[model samples]
Target: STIEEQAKTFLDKFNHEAEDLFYQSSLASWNYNTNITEENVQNMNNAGDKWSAFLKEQSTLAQMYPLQEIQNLTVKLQLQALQQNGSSVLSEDKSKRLNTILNTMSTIYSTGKVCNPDNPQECLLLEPGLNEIMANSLDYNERLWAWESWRSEVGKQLRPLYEEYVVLKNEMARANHYEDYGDYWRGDYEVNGVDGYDYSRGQLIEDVEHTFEEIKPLYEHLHAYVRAKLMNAYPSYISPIGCLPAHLLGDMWGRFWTNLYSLTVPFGQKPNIDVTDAMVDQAWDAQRIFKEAEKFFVSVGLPNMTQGFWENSMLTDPGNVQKAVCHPTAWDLGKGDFRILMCTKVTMDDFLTAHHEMGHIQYDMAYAAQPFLLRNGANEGFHEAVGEIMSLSAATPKHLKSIGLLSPDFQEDNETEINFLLKQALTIVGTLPFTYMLEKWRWMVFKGEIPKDQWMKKWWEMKREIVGVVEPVPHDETYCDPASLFHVSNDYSFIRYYTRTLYQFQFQEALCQAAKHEGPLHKCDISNSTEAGQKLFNMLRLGKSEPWTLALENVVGAKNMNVRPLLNYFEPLFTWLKDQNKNSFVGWSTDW
Candidate 1:
């Protein structure tokens, strides 16, 4: 309780500071709205200097949180275990002790651990241009030239944690037998809903395996197809963010879809649906429909694939495609809502990236007037849920037709119901495995059972065993390394992406329902501004002051955040996937 109180106090102070910073920056960069020019963009950045500093602090702190509280908590828990169960079955179990050490020492690969806080030096340790953006952004004249010169070097500075990971792994291999060293053993008991779970040892390997088992083989073909389609759809001008080439967008795209195998999806169980992975027919059906949607996208002028997608169907291999990169850095300016720092080349996707940033912009604009105290209380997924709802809704066939991402040749009188249902189902099923595997991996890394080198093999094999992917790509410096992406180092942040994907589907349905579209399944085009785009924008710009659920209710007439509903939504998709029979090149054989 005392600790809880202290947390609240820290949050309160943080909120006050954040609120003041938000307002000051908003006022300074007042004119750089989505409607602004490049000149205004520079002006906005200049004005945003204050906000940028604040954001730098925020980024630094976000990276710091895991180590600050989470690390210390581990130490405390271990000490308590020493006082209590120091001599339990764990103390003398040679194999278990090694696993435990593996987990505890896993923190060296992280940018956010407590013991090694504020080590900007690690940024350069990343491979394949992980710090390419920051390096390019640097002012050679700045002090600590490499570290002090960039606004968002947090990603770069996080490399030491990975190096630390190497040292720890080598140490474990050297220890060989458990009797050689027992000095680091601070016992552990009861923490984070799993009683006596030692994060340093393989304390939660069972749970990790359990989660791995449950979330495998989720809509493999559909996910890969969509990812490929999206990558191909990107205009030629759009360069991969960082120094990555534009042509490799396909590979860049694959990396994203591949890592998502353990990311997160809408997990639920409700009437008219069961979870997605359990049924094969539903998954295949989703692919067929989405393929149709892809046709619709091409008909509306978006980049279209010539050949039918060949699904990657290996289910038990451990090393697969490298970890996804360039997912969020598309337009993420470290601070402020004015997203002027264009990370990639111009394209409709980039345009959507604009709207995505704008959604964050509107969020800041609407909430700017609120008092700081109450403003500080929303959960992690709150704002991101809203933005995802806005951005994804902008991707429908109707919207695509409007923005020229889809073909204008297609004509459908009542496609909303089918399209919305299809969209919702795909988002839920396609992204489902993301959370399960990643979290499992995190627990393993934290507990020490899995070595960093083995992470790629373990990750891929685990995916094959659980999610059912056939292709196992070797580790590449650009992608698989943990230090390369955002959420891999930032614990639990992917929860927002998972929850937000579902929430966005709900928001789409609500908008259709409110427009009197006959249930949440009406076929409407809100993608184009001159035609369907206007309605979509209106729905998007609706002020966000109301509680998120309440705001969602305002658009959709009701709110459903329960995990079960989201999970059930994917039932149709799962059913479709399993029914492939002889056509089933890729599918999960058993329901977890």
Candidate 2:
């Protein structure tokens, strides 16, 4: 607590210096020419690099000054980098680089983050005035409308397969004990698991290959339609960005086009929806608790809230060093003071995710107090690491109770606790591989290693390995395509989330420790938003004030971002499920 006070004192000093730099830089830009000239743009590009470095240093130093200061700094960086779209610094071939940057930035922002220039319609610097700021905000909104319109038409186009799939899925669930195998195949020891249908490993592989083959025609049909539609609707999508020719974006977006040819949809599904329904049914309580949290975002205001991901994602390794094929998403803070977007529209688990994003909003708000130059985080992970701690803290059972999800009867019961934990665990398990494989497969295809037809097969193979589901998921023409919402537009920089999962949990452990058994998890009320909690956000306010690891250590007291905490939490759930095999919701009981 004392150290936090001292950090705040230093922050006060940092902000003053930062403001000086912003004013200095703004004045320096006063005489800038309006020429969209290639050479002039190239010079601006060169100037921007110098500016970026200066900004990075100021922001990085802020992190070094205090505990978890880096998180706030990272948020600031994201907001700034997103200003010129994903391509912050311009190149000599000005138009090409500028346009490439705009396309990437737009996609990145649409998914998450947006930049507004000073003049609602006119200036170089992005600022969110009371009026709308984007060049064609209406056009942008209309595009989403267009996409949705197309979605409806496409649904009508594919209604037959959707209806047929429903029939088969229901028939399997109604007649069989195991969703996929039927009554005869349901008993555990009565029949072999995956091995029952084959005599040898070679034979098994062959059989699996054959299964893929049998389903290949169906896969091809669905894919052909989806591909043709996507291509027709947006042929210009492929080569919209990147240095490797104007035709690459389509390939990047359609990297897994071949996989659609081999799709075999999952054939079995348990007929129950207990855990999922419980969470959704009770989500109202979480929403109210989230409302209290929303107060924080509204207070932060727009300038602080709207930034980009480039501060973190782009700079972490410029040109995306670790994952070469990974498309750099525009990572800015959200526009409009509308806080907690997730809390409003989404439900259950990821409503919690939306809250985390709002943490970024508030963190950036606090950074607005800083000189613009010093208003970023130490790194991308640092921003994430910061936003993460606050989000997790909000998700605590007590935090949920504060909102209404847990009543007295629901609070502190071992059965409820175990059940709640299990559901949460499964939620993560169900989602993790989807997130992981989406990127890994894209990278594989980018290098020309994966044949097009193997995509859905590879996806299913990965799913079976991780989830071990007993049924097959038939490829849905609307959803299975890699280009759908869950893939292309979603998780653009998913690696940050994937790589930091363990780190996030480790921070969670630290919070419980900091709470000393009386924290949000164990506590009973709204009052759990203690000074320590306030101080925690105070650290976030510092933004990119430290490296992600260091900021986490300072805020949560994690000794390491190890697998120990994650293993501790998930392994038991995995073991429990392996033994029980069914929850009331999933209905895997009786094995037929």
Candidate 3:
């Protein structure tokens, strides 16, 4: 009785402290992201230090009472949430140095710009140039320069720092009773408080591998077709059966091939739905684009954006005043201050992106009723999946026609449908193995499974084997190519992206069924379906107050992640790609 009372009292006080700490830390992060100043960096560091100290101390305190002794369900989950060893870097006393190394890496990457050799004064930043250069591909060498230069400098600059970061994170993991940093990362989705709800790390790995195997045939088809098309685009560089050179794919990281749609689409003579010109012609500015997303949520019966969202969000590029990190992000500062920071563009991608970011706001608002620790999604993947569900709907021709983006006479024919499916495959199907393989390499690196000397070599070896993508230029140990990515440099668990892809399809299928007008999974548009909205809320409202399995069951009617919905959604495109690649190699040679 005393232990239970102590636990309850401890939680109440901790929850209150948590609200203030998280809010202040978030505000500090916002300031730094909006204006990349040294002072702002210091402020963020100080704010994070405070929050980290609290969590470290409280996280330690929560472990004293045996979890079995705690009978209250709410208390049990809340304690489990807190005791998840919150941050890999922050959970230890070595935070000051680790945070410094982390901050230095982040600042350099965020402010880092690539210069054109021809015009040294003319330079490009990631957000500003990544969008432009990837699209401006006819000037092929210029694209190579941006991709090569980005890897050359940022990765080069981060090599020494990331080396120490690995050692420090490994120590932090050991301090928290984990074998390695990668093991700690894989523990994110491991739920183990209540019986029948205990999800293990082994289960996550098994499920991901199983799901990847299920989707492999589809990815093989997409890769072969895209490689064949790119060979036509860049005649001498590509081999029909060879892995694709990374720079030519689409963007800096080759994370998403959405930009490669024009180059890789099956029927280019019949262009698919890219409403960039249409949105721009229709006079849609940043603010108007945001309002459209706002109306979208209300249409499906979700919460409105808080007034603070409109007033405080750094929607447009604030580069006019000060250099800002233009990475698109959604934020939930406590006390109902939810916002997004995006250098908005008038493109179909950004239009869907706005809806996606707003879905974060919708989630933040929906779970506002929960305790501070429970305010986030049941898992990080669930949060991303929630946003992606909106994009899945918004990307449909039916939704576009409804919103006046497409012509009234717009029709979906076999060619148009294949075009649409291929476009979706470019991003969704294209990125699965990429994320899986990247995280796999990182996991190996973190676990010390890969030798330090062979890091660069092994990275590409796995990249070719899993993603069927290769490096344009040879990378040596001096080049920290992983650090060039935002997720790696910023210290996020990469596996969440892989899981989110699976969970999004699972979530979409459930919502589509509730909406009651879906002919196919990919064609699902739950825009006005309040029934679907209600079903989504049923899970979102629970937040992290319960196991993700139960919440997932509430919406998707399954206790485990399912790949059928994803494969079923893409069956049409898979068939088309297989037929398209009849004479081409479906996989790549990793004999590099």
Candidate 4:
């Protein structure tokens, strides 16, 4: 009893300091252009480094407590502290080094702009230029330059810093008794339920590999078709099975090939839905988009977004602000304030993105009822999964029609289904291997399995083997390609995205079943189902108070994560895509 009481006292104080620090940091991140805000963030981080060290010292004592809840909370708090501190003991030199790397990353990512070299006056990778060039430009070199320019000098500038940061993180994790940073971070996936089974790191790896194997065939077919098409377009540029230029596939990293739809779709056919046109038809702006998203939450029986969200959130860039990070993000101050920062525009993608960010706000509100320590998603991936569920729903033809975003005249047929599936496949399904490999590579690097000399070579090897993406141009040792990706430079976990992609489908299927809708999984929408909403609430409000499986089970019935629902949901599309690629050369040839 005495131990439990002591633990509670420590938690109360810890929570108070943490909440204040979080709010300040979020405010600073929102207006990072201000020197004062930037300094404030660094100061908060410095303070946070010390606080976490203190928590680590106390954790040993708290673990001796008898109460199950106290033990769990103690472990949770220690993990949180260790993750933030990045070292058992904070030093001014080490802390400053880490912060400098972070600041440099922010400066590079936010300020870097890609310009077309041929047209020295042409800035081709900005708003209208990006879409215009990728979607419509026939000049292969133009698209190549646009894609290449995105990472040109960034890799050379940040590679050394990123490598040092990784080493520091590994050192910190080891000091905390973890094998390395990867193992320490991967432990976040653990979820205990009444069931005997536990979702461990080994289980996560196994499940991801198994799921990707099931989906790899579909990805192979798509890649082969693209290779054939590109080969036909520029015979001299591409050889049979040779690597295709990533830009020619219509995306910077080949994560999505939506731009290639015009090339891949059967000759003389167009998709049934025109998402851009629908957005134009509705005259949707940022405010209107968010309002519709809020309505989506209310309709589904989830809590509506807080009114403060509308009044204070930086929904879009304030035009005059230069050097702002244009990437969309959601912030929860851990007090009562929640905001979203995005450069919104009148487009279907942005509309869906708004709904996705609103999903995070709803999550924050739902979980605010929990104790400060238990206020986040059950795991890092859960928050992203929740948002993706709403975004995916918003993208559906049926949901779009119901919301007046799609024409009622829109019809679904085999061809239409194929078109829709192809577009999503290029992005959602095609990127699965790529997303999974991000952390896989980092983990290997963290473990010293891949040496500094072999880093670039190994990255491309994995990309070719797993992502089915090969580099169109040669890169030397000086270029740090991995640092070109924002997540890599910022030290963000990549596995959450892979997990969220799978979880969203699982959540969607469960919600559809809860609504008692008898139809194809893809067609079922739970937006207006109160039963589904309540089920979701039961899980969301628990936050991290209970094991993730308990929250997952409350909604999905199963405690174990699986990809059956995802496969089931896309069964029709999979069958159609397979048939379409049956006679085509559906795999890539490597010339490099």
Worst 10 residues of 4 by lDDT: 79-88
**TM-score of every candidate relative to the true structure:** 0.42, 0.41, 0.86, 0.83
Q: After superposition, which runs of candidate 2 have C-alpha atoms over 4 Å from their true positions? A: 1-358, 365-370, 373-410, 444-480, 485-491, 518-531, 534-542, 556-560, 570-575, 582-592
Candidate 4 or 2, higher TM-score: 4
How many angstroms is residue 228 displaced in model 3 relative to the true structure, after the best TM-score fit?
A: 0.8
- Model 4 agreement with the true structure over 468-512: per-residue lDDT tens digits: 666776787566677766566567787787778888889988888
Better of 1 and 4 by TM-score: 4
- Residues 1-592, candidate 2: write the lDDT tens digits: 5665564455555555545544444323321232224665565556556656655565555535533333344443433332222222223364354445446534543432222334346422112331122222323233333333333333333334323433343343344233331121112112121232212223322332343333233222232333333344454533211111111111212222222211211112322112345545555454444455565444322223223321222222122222222221223322212222221334444455555665665556555543443456533444565456555455555555554545545444433444444434433332344344455555444433555434556654544333222121244344333443333433254545543554555655555554445433323222343544654555565644333444455665542334455555555444444344322122112111
Best candidate, lDDT:
3
Tell me how far the alpha carbon of residue 192 in candidate 2 is from the true structure, in angstroms, after superposition.
53
lDDT of 4 at 210: 82
Say which candidate scores most in TM-score: 3
Provide the overall lDDT of each model, using Cα atoms, as 2-decimal numbers.
Answer: 0.39, 0.39, 0.79, 0.70
Q: Which window of ten consecutive residues has the lowest lDDT sum in model 2? A: 240-249
